[PDB]
Design a binder for this molecule. Structure first.
Ligand SMILES: CCCCc1nc(N)[se]c1CCC
Length: 148
């Protein structure tokens, strides 16, 4: 069961709409994730937009208790890979920004642009369980025009 490798964002959900719209810090276009269990770290590479222009990031988080990871970006973040199939990952993240406001978010990742409904139904369920309404879900594949 390989979790490390190429991963592209298809959908994102958020308890705070301010964090996931156009040019927001969390409209994230994932490209790859590498879990380094020997050194208890995770490597994240993705694009985001500021001023409507693609910018690339490469972050390094640290593994913490209970399969969770801490990583700094637009504040402090603690996330976990809630679900994993051969075709997708569903990540749950809690962010506390510089102002101290807390936001819970979910993301569905895949190996490309062709979504499997079975994975998508699970993403919606996890999103719902986190108290996030369907109307707070954004289609990222539709918005990802950044470099491969
Ligand atoms: C999984 C969708 C993006 C969530 C997410 N974006 C960041 N930037 Se840090 C965070 C933690 C999960 C890697």
């Amino acid at each position: 069961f390989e979790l490390s490798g190429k991963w592209i964002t298809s959908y994102i959900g958020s308890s705070d709409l301010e964090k996931i719209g156009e040019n927001a810090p969390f409209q994230v276009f994932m490209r790859s994730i590498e879990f380094d269990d020997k050194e208890s770290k995770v490597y994240l590479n993705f694009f985001s937009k500021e001023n409507g222009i693609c910018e690339e990031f490469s972050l390094i988080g640290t593994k913490q208790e209970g399969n969770t990871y801490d990583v700094n970006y637009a504040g402090n973040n603690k996330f976990v890979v809630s679900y994993a199939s051969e075709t997708a990952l569903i990540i749950s993240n809690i962010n506390v920004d510089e102002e101290g406001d807390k936001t819970i978010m979910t993301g569905l990742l895949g190996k490309g642009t062709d979504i499997e409904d079975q994975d998508l139904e699970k993403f919606k369920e996890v999103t719902r369980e986190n108290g996030i309404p369907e109307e707070n879900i954004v289609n990222i594949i539709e918005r990802d025009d950044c470099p491969a």
